[PDB]
Amino acid sequence: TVTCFVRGSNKMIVDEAERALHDSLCVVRNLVKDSRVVYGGGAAEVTMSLAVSEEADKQRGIDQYAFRGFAQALDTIPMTLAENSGLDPIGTLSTLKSKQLKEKISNIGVDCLGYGSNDMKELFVVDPFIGKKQQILLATQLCRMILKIDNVIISGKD
Amino acid sequence: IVVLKEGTDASQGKGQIISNINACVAVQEALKPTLGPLGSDILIVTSNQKTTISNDGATILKLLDVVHPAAKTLVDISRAQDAEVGDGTTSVTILAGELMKEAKPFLEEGISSHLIMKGYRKAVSLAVEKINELAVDITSEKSSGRELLERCARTAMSSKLIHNNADFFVKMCVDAVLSLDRNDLDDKLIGIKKIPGGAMEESLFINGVAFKKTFSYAGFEQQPKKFNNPKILSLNVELELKAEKDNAEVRVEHVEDYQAIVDAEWQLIFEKLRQVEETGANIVLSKLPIGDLATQFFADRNIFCAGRVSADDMNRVIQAVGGSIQSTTSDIKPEHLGTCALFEEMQIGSERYNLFQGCPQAKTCTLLLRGGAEQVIAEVERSLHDAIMIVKRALQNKLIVAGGGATEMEVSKCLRDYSKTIAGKQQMIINAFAKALEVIPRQLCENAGFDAIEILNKLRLAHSKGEKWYGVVFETENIGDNFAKFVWEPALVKINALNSATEATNLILSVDETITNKG
Amino acid sequence: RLSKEARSMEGVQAFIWQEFASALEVIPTTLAENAGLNSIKVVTELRSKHENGELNDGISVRRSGTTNTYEEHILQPVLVSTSAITLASECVKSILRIDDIAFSR
Numbered sequence: 001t002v003t004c005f006v007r008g009s010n011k012m013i014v015d016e017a018e019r020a021l022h023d024s025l026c027v028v029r030n031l032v033k034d035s036r037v038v039y040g041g042g043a044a045e046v047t048m049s050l051a052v053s054e055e056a057d058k059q060r061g062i063d064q065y066a067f068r069g070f071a072q073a074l075d076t077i078p079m080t081l082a083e084n085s086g087l088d089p090i091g092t093l094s095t096l097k098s099k100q101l102k103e104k105i106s107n108i109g110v111d112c113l114g115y116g117s118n119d120m121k122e123l124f125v126v127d128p129f130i131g132k133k134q135q136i137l138l139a140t141q142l143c144r145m146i147l148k149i150d151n152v153i154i155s156g157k158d
Numbered sequence: 159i160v161v162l163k164e165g166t167d168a169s170q171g172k173g174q175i176i177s178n179i180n181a182c183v184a185v186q187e188a189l190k191p192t193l194g195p196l197g198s199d200i201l202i203v204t205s206n207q208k209t210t211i212s213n214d215g216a217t218i219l220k221l222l223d224v225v226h227p228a229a230k231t232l233v234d235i236s237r238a239q240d241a242e243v244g245d246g247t248t249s250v251t252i253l254a255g256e257l258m259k260e261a262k263p264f265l266e267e268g269i270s271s272h273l274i275m276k277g278y279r280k281a282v283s284l285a286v287e288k289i290n291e292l293a294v295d296i297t298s299e300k301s302s303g304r305e306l307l308e309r310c311a312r313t314a315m316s317s318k319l320i321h322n323n324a325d326f327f328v329k330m331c332v333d334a335v336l337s338l339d340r341n342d343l344d345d346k347l348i349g350i351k352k353i354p355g356g357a358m359e360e361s362l363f364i365n366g367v368a369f370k371k372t373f374s375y376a377g378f379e380q381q382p383k384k385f386n387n388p389k390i391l392s393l394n395v396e397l398e399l400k401a402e403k404d405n406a407e408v409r410v411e412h413v414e415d416y417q418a419i420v421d422a423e424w425q426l427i428f429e430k431l432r433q434v435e436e437t438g439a440n441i442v443l444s445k446l447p448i449g450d451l452a453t454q455f456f457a458d459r460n461i462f463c464a465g466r467v468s469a470d471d472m473n474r475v476i477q478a479v480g481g482s483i484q485s486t487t488s489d490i491k492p493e494h495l496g497t498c499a500l501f502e503e504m505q506i507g508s509e510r511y512n513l514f515q516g517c518p519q520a521k522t523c524t525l526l527l528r529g530g531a532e533q534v535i536a537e538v539e540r541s542l543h544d545a546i547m548i549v550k551r552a553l554q555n556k557l558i559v560a561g562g563g564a565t566e567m568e569v570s571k572c573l574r575d576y577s578k579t580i581a582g583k584q585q586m587i588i589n590a591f592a593k594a595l596e597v598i599p600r601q602l603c604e605n606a607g608f609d610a611i612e613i614l615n616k617l618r619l620a621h622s623k624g625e626k627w628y629g630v631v632f633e634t635e636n637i638g639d640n641f642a643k644f645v646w647e648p649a650l651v652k653i654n655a656l657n658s659a660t661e662a663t664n665l666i667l668s669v670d671e672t673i674t675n676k677g
Numbered sequence: 678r679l680s681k682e683a684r685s686m687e688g689v690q691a692f693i694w695q696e697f698a699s700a701l702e703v704i705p706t707t708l709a710e711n712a713g714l715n716s717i718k719v720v721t722e723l724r725s726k727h728e729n730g731e732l733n734d735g736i737s738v739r740r741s742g743t744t745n746t747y748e749e750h751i752l753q754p755v756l757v758s759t760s761a762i763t764l765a766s767e768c769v770k771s772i773l774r775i776d777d778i779a780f781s782r
Contacts, residue, residue: 053684060728061725064721064724091688094686094690094692097687102685134530138531141534149211150199152200153201155203155205609715
């Protein structure tokens with residue numbers, strides 16, 4: 001066992017620095033459990049969208065509308081990051097796409113933290129691959145559970 | 159000035175029957191998405207503040223608590239469906255309600271409901287006779303003991319998230335039914351414990367009983383968790399040092415008396431605590447917490463103990479090792495003790511789980527399930543419940559009929575021809591009954607996303623061509639034979655469904671007036 | 678074809694030029710609806726045949742399904758479709774260019 005000693009100039013400062021360190025401990029736990037890593041900010045949702053959009057035409061069916069909307073739903077995350085960073089969500093998203101198409105498929109993310117370029121590699125922004133897989137899984141799982149509910153009956157409090 | 163009802167609402171006439179029809183449609187409309195293995199699930203919030211989501215019509219109608227009398231009759235007949243059979247509570251209400259919808263235009267034409275109810279009784283009497291003709295006796299015929307149980311469980315597990323791992327899950331599902339006496343099979347005797355975390359294919363089957371290991375008290379790194387033939391002792395009272403509730407008032411003026419009353423509180427507890435060792439039992443189980451003093455004294459003598467065990471799990475321990483629960487530590491008799499073949503505490507799922515294994519006297523078992531999320535495992539458990547009921551009824555009932563739309567069409571097919579010989583109002587009533595039988599295969603296609611217009615019409619074609627076994631394929635959308643696809647239901651389900659649905663329909667159609675007294 | 682050509686662009690050129698292609702799908706949708714055919718089903722069948730095959734595959738009300746419209750003698754001259762998108766783009770322009778309506782006598 002170990003004890004992390006945390007201090008701060010105010011209550012909320014102590015709780016913030018304590019939970020921020022705990023968030024880093026959860027990242028280190030995933031990095032040791034799984035050595036496979038990807039650069040997750042703004043990079044993953046675009047690469048996932050570009051691959052599904054190309055394979056949507058080959059499926060030829062109901063899945064074509066489901067895969068096209070799936071790629072557009074993935075684009076919500078990087079556009080949301082661009083809206084929180086003060087950038088054009090439409091302009092930044094396509095800028096990340098053209099850099100990952102005309103040149104090569106790689107991880108190039110949103111400018112939220114800031115740098116001379118949008119590359120997530122030299123910027124050292126990394127997310128666990130097992131963390132990105134469980135994120136896109138449980139999200140799709142509950143989406144099927146919400147659509148699994150065709151009737152809602154709610155009673156009162158007796 | 160005078161009033162007849164004294165303010166007690168009573169309404170009659172044909173409008174009261176129409177009000178009973180609208181109630182049957184409201185109950186049917188709620189159960190329509192819940193029909194079929196691929197059917198949608200309903201969200202129900204009880205006044206107890208417990209949110210539940212299930213597709214089983216029994217649990218659905220029990221948690222709704224519909225006060226409407228004509229709608230409550232559909233709930234009471236569904237509980238009878240859960241009693242006589244136990245499966246198909248969703249289809250019995252939908253089919254009974256569809257008889258109310260088809261009888262609605264007859265009420266507007268001026269046709270009495272008694273001739274309508276008499277027409278159904280003659281239609282069901284002919285329907286049950288056709289089911290006996292569709293009943294196929296099969297045991298060893300063109301099937302082995304292993305292939306009969308496996309191939310039927312694969313179909314119930316098909317079109318699910320377990321489809322790829324189904325090969326491993328059928329083995330644990332077949333072994334779970336064979337772990338019990340084939341003369342009496344109870345779904346309550348098969349235990350299922352959900353383990354959060356881990357891979358779905360690594361799930362294990364336990365011959366004995368397991369529980370949550372709720373013991374929260376310190377003293378770890380002792381009390382070895384692996385025993386060969388442990389002596390299991392069921393306990394009631396509380397062995398903790400500092401007790402839970404009561405106390406006493408003792409006034410002493412001396413320092414040696416201060417330590418004496420503390421040792422007195424220890425000696426009174428250690429008395430009954432040492433009597434546990436005098437029994438010589440390795441496992442100590444109690445529905446009440448086992449404190450730090452007790453688990454420490456058990457650690458020196460290498461006795462394992464777990465406190466605050468659920469009462470539902472302790473009852474299965476009695477059914478496992480054949481033990482008995484004793485209240486005190488004094489009078490404990492040797493026959494109340496029990497022993498398993500192996501005992502181990504598993505860390506599976508990043509959580510400690512005690513399990514009994516290899517109990518020859520066990521009338522119950524436990525099947526562990528693993529997966530990436532607790533909600534996914536719950537869907538695996540419910541998809542397993544549907545698979546267990548098919549494997550269970552396969553051994554208990556050797557008379558089967560082809561399901562998944564097969565039998566539903568053949569019953570509706572012949573009654574349309576039988577109505578040609580009968581003339582008068584009974585002809586349109588039997589035709590309405592056969593038309594009311596079309597809602598079952600319809601909703602199966604609508605709940606699974608299939609087109610109800612094309613598939614049903616194509617099903618009415620090939621089935622009319624002289625082959626009676628054509629059902630609806632739930633995997634790849636098309637018409638096909640479910641006898642080859644192995645969608646099977648016993649004949650007692652189809653007979654009791656037509657008997658119970660028409661019975662509840664005949665009770666509602668016979669109600670002219672609803673008198674409700676206030677108070 | 679235009680949706681694949683929009684993937685090679687950057688910035689704004691990516692987003693809106695996808696919506697223009699989706700607005701072209703209303704013509705085959707209304708043809709399938711007015712003929713009683715399934716909207717989603719027929720469009721996916723034609724989008725299926727246009728990846729391998731070519732323009733010859735389309736909706737035919739005579740066959741009540743998707744078949745070759747060149748062998749069925751259904752022929753639309755190019756100027757009709759050329760003057761269609763052209764006048765449609767000028768109409769939508771003249772609309773969006775109107776930011777207000779004021780009474781002036």
